[PDB]
Structure formats: structure tokens, C-alpha cells
């Protein structure tokens with residue numbers, strides 16, 4: 001959840017908002033180790049429920065998200081249903097556990113390609129065109145993350161937009177991402193420069209991957 | 212002496228506008244068939260399966276024409292080569308269907324088949340079904356017959372399935388055409404076509420358009 005003024009500005013300037021719970025357990029092995037554990041349901045529940053209680057009156061918020069990169073655990077299904085029950089006005093989405101689980105109203109993959117399948121075990125990223133028509137599948141597809149804009153990037157961006165326009169159920173996506181997470185450091189003369197991972201003696205680090 | 216007056220054009224031509232040579236005549240077989248007065252007039256064969264196709268029920272509905280008699284029987288027998296695998300015998304008289312009773316001139320035979328050899332384009336396993344119309348005492352009146360292929364075709368979850376598996380149709384449309392004989396088909400040309408089709412990795416044909 002963002003600083004509260006963000007939603008005010010989105011209401012007034014006009015931007016659709018996905019409001020997302022502060023839950024990410026990416027570094028767990030497997031990713032859902034905590035989110036499938038009932039011991040962690042109370043902590044997770046508050047991050048979902050208290051977001052809804054705060055932001056439910058903002059017209060800019062159109063979709064609730066259960067968090068990010070926390071696998072798919074039973075705690076997600078419980079909290080999916082909680083939101084559906086208290087606020088039927090907004091779809092609920094969540095990418096973890098393969099982007100098309102029982103905890104999401106929207107097929108919301110990250111970095112699924114337009115034409116190319118990436119058939120990873122358990123959590124495949126199908127071609128978005130292919131994903132829509134998998135047997136029994138009927139949901140809209142909106143990428144929660146796509147076109148990773150790291151350094152000299154956005155090659156193939158047009159391929160996404162051609163597909164979005166041709167396919168009714170491909171309803172777009174959210175580019176990753178808006179702004180480089182670089183930080184200002186200063187040389188001996190006080191001149192500023194842009195710093196990334198490892199520049200603060202921080203270790204281990206992931207270097208330029210924050211930009 | 213038979214006399215046949217064949218018209219090139221009819222009201223039927225309005226339903227026969229296929230993209231092909233427009234021809235006319237007696238272009239398929241002519242035959243004479245002798246049936247007894249008490250006869251098999253129709254029969255339908257169905258094969259239904261359990262979830263893993265390890266068990267099947269062959270269901271054969273048989274219809275008779277002629278005088279209904281208590282001594283009349285139908286035996287449907289199922290053969291794999293020279294081995295009889297299953298057999299059923301019953302008198303005529305179908306199940307009650309409505310307020311006025313059932314079909315007195317029909318009978319349905321049900322045969323169990325354990326571990327049936329399944330039919331597909333990959334392995335065209337066939338059984339032979341013989342339908343015997345006879346007296347209770349065992350005098351044959353007549354027999355009809357057909358090749359039986361045990362297979363289930365269904366659409367489930369948006370997929371066309373044969374024997375529970377999603378098909379990939381390597382198909383071709385085929386007209387009945389011969390450069391010398393027109394639209395008259397012969398066994399040699401049919402076989403020639405099928406051999407070439409399978410040799411070129413086709414598994415399916417559409418009877419375009421008749």
C-alpha cells in the first residue's frame with residue numbers, strides 16, 4: 001500500500017490503480033513455505049484486511065492484489081475469499097504459484113512472452129496468446145509485470161501491443177517499471193553520482209538489478 | 212426387365228451445388244437383395260466404456276419386420292478372429308418407453324467385454340459382430356453382420372478426445388473422382404488413395420461433400 005496521497009492524486013488526475021498488500025516472501029524455499037502455513041495466516045491477514053479497510057473508498061483503486069512473489073499457499077485462498085466477501089466491487093488478483101491459480105480473477109503472469117512458451121516445471125509461463133485458450137480457461141489476461149526496462153531495453157515492446165490490440169481477452173499489462181532505484185552518493189569534491197547495489201558496502205547485493 | 216429414367220436436373224440439384232464436375236447417371240452399384248419375410252430390418256451398435264477403457268459394454272439394438280412370435284430370438288455374438296469373445300440372446304420386446312408400452316418388434320442385447328482392443332487410426336483393432344435372427348430352438352432365419360471398433364469420441368473441456376486422448380487431425384478432403392470414369396469409384400482407386408494417404412502421414416479424411 002502506498003502513501004495515502006497517491007490514491008487522492010490518482011482519483012483526481014485519473015489513473016487506474018492496483019492496490020497491493022505488503023506481502024512478499026520471495027526468498028523462502030519453496031516460495032510458499034510461509035503462505036501455506038496457518039501460523040502465518042494472522043500476520044498475512046492484517047496486511048490484506050487493513051489495506052482494504054483503508055483504501056476501499058478510492059475510485060482509482062479498481063483491483064485488489066494479495067501481494068507479490070509468495071508462491072501460492074492456502075492462506076492466499078482464505079484471503080482471496082475474504083476480499084470477495086467484504087468487497088464484491090473489485091476483482092482480486094495474485095500472480096504467485098503460476099499466475100492462474102484459484103486465488104486470482106485475472107490471469108496475471110509476469111514476463112510471459114507473446115508467442116514464445118517458457119514451460120517451467122509447476123509454474124510455466126505460457127505464450128499469452130496460448131494461455132487464454134488453454135482447456136477450460138475463460139479469464140482475462142493482464143500481465144502484472146512485462147517489458148523489463150533495465151538499461152538499454154524494451155526490445156519487442158511493439159509485439160505486446162499488437163497482441164493486446166488483436167486479442168479481446170489480452171487486456172494489457174504493467175511495465176516493470178517506472179523509476180530506477182538508484183541512490184545519490186558524493187565524490188571527494190561533493191559531486192553527486194548515481195549508485196546501485198554494493199555501493200554502500202552492502203553485501204551480498206544484486207548490483208544494478210535495482211535499476 | 213428393369214427400366215430406369217434418370218433425370219440430370221431435379222429440385223434435388225438445388226442441394227447439390229458442390230464445387231465439382233456436374234455429371235449424371237447410375238454411377239454407383241446396382242444390386243438385388245433377398246430377405247426373408249421375418250427379417251432384421253435395422254440394427255445399431257454402441258460401445259460404452261469405464262474411465263480407463265479397461266471395461267466395455269457393447270449394446271446392440273435390433274429391429275425386426277414380419278410377424279411377432281414368442282419363439283423368435285436374436286443372438287448378437289462378438290468375435291476377435293476365430294475366437295468368440297461374448298454373446299447375448301434374447302426374445303423380442305424392448306423396455307417400457309412410455310404410457311403405451313415399448314417396442315414389441317425390438318430387442319437390445321448387452322455384452323460385456325473385458326480389456327477391449329481399442330480402435331484408432333494408429334491401430335485399427337476390429338471385432339466382428341454377427342446378428343442372428345433365429346428360433347428359440349436354434350433354426351437360423353438370417354444373419355447380418357458388421358465390423359466393430361471399440362472407441363469413444365467425446366468433447367471434454369474444449370478438447371476432442373478419442374479413447375480419452377486429444378486428437379491431432381492430419382486430415383485431407385477427398386472427392387470421389389477418377390480421370391477416366393468420372394465419379395464412379397472402384398476398390399483399386401479407393402485402396403490406392405488410402406495407402407498413399409497413410410504413407411504421407413494422414414490419419415483423417417473428410418467426405419467432401421456427400
Ligand SMILES: O=C1O[C@H](CO)[C@H](O)[C@H](O)[C@H]1O
Pocket residue numbers: 229230419
Ligand atoms: O470453400 C471451399 O473451397 C474449395 C475451393 O476449391 C472448394 O470449393 C470446397 O468445396 C469449398 O468448400
Ligand SMILES: [Mg+2]
Pocket residue numbers: 228229230
Ligand atoms: Mg462451394
Ligand code: NA
Pocket residue numbers: 163164165166167168169170171172
Ligand atoms: Na485486447
Ligand code: NA
Pocket residue numbers: 209210211
Ligand atoms: Na529489480
